[PDB]
Design a protein around this ligand. Structure first.
Ligand code: FMN
Ligand code: O8R
Length: 363
């Protein structure tokens, strides 16, 4: 089973290739990591296994879900340290995903009820609805298009949050540049209509992600930085006219950051949408173009994960939904044991136990 061959992710020695994908679960009440998160990640941690946290706020304006953790205050850093310690006690490696939602927010999630920020004033269309704190669904509002000074402040928010993650003991961070959130709102020409130096050309649309990655690399070192993108996922009205070219442009800029820094990033992490042959070709083209470690995600199974590693399509495979309901997913994949079903109704509820830590281990 090639999923259980070791892998050197830079300075981290992984014992197997099964990764916990980042998943928002909304149990971090008031944006403060809670003890329940420690139990949840501890259940899924394995010796030499790699975990990526739920998306984590970089600033008071970065959220678009209820009760998601932040890492921009010292109180948040203190509580994260307790969780990181219990994960490290099991021998796992853990990265904190840094997440700004941009226009994918609502007045209820913003300080003083202000408008969310974005590359443009275009809202997500009414085809999509936002989960509200009371469990109903609301309307995405028109965002405020930020100028270049404010862009530089957001870059600094990523940098400070990366330093805070290291202070909490995280092994590294992942930049969430996928799924139609803030970075993707600059990348995708279906959203970014700017006429300044951050819009127009493919090069200009890639400027923001380049500056973010450069800032965190300078702060904590390239080998502690992963980058997640999704050029071919259209979530929240985030489409590009040429997804493969957009993806290769991002890959080119990551390759150049590495040469400039004299070090490789921890990895490139790409979601696929789920013809199948074309979509796999898109993924393999990005993998082949990138000088480093490649993590694939999106609809993977035991069989598909084994085939991805064996055929050289990916170095690591991340699993989301099956890790929700199978705390021992790594062991079950190793043994080819039957998997437990997941309950979508409790993906984003606030209960510290129900649908969170009460999925059973293998019987
Ligand atoms: C409940 C839930 C929350 C998610 N939250 C995030 C997130 O915070 N950050 C992120 O990059 N992806 C997020 N995603 C996507 C997952 O990381 C992953 O790509 C996806 O679940 C992989 O597909 P799979 O569930 O078929 O394994 C989330 C997915 C789910 C189901
Ligand atoms: C198209 O698949 C959905 C992609 O968006 C996500 O997975 C996500 N965060 O990135 C959440 C919080 O749901």
């Amino acid at each position: 089973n090639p999923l259980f061959s070791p892998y050197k992710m830079g300075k981290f020695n992984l014992s197997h290739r099964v990764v916990l994908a980042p998943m928002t679960r909304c149990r971090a009440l008031n944006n403060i990591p809670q003890a329940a998160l420690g139990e949840y990640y501890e259940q899924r941690a394995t010796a030499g296994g790699f975990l990526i946290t739920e998306g984590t706020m970089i600033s008071p304006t970065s959220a678009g879900f209820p009760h998601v953790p932040g890492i921009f205050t010292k109180e948040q850093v203190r509580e994260w340290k307790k969780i990181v310690d219990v994960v490290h006690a099991k021998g796992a490696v853990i990265f904190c995903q840094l997440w700004h939602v941009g226009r994918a927010s609502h007045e209820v999630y913003q300080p003083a009820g202000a408008a969310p920020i974005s590359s443009t004033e275009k809202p997500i269309s009414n085809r999509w609805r936002i989960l509200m704190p009371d469990g109903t669904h609301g309307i995405y509002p028109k965002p405020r298009a930020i100028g270049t000074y404010e862009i530089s402040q957001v870059v600094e928010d990523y940098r400070r949050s990366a330093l805070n993650a290291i202070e909490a003991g995280f092994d590294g961070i992942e930049i969430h540049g996928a799924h139609g959130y803030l970075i993707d709102q600059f990348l995708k020409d279906g959203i970014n209509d700017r006429t300044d130096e951050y819009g127009g050309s493919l090069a200009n649309r890639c400027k923001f992600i380049t500056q973010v990655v450069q800032a965190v690399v300078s702060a904590i070192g390239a080998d502690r930085v992963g980058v997640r993108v999704s050029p071919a996922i259209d979530h929240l009205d985030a489409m590009d006219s040429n997804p493969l070219s957009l993806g290769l442009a991002v890959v080119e800029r990551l390759n150049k950051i590495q040469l400039h820094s004299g070090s490789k990033l921890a990895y490139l992490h790409v979601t696929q949408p789920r013809s199948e042959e074309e979509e796999a070709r898109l993924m393999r083209t990005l993998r082949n173009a990138y000088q480093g470690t490649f993590i694939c995600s999106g609809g993977y199974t035991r069989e598909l994960g084994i085939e991805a590693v064996a055929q050289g399509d990916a170095d690591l495979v991340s699993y989301g939904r099956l890790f929700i309901s199978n705390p021992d997913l790594v062991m079950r994949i190793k043994l080819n044991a039957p998997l437990n079903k997941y309950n979508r109704k409790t993906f984003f509820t606030q209960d510290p136990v129900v649908g969170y830590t009460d999925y059973p281990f293998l019987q």
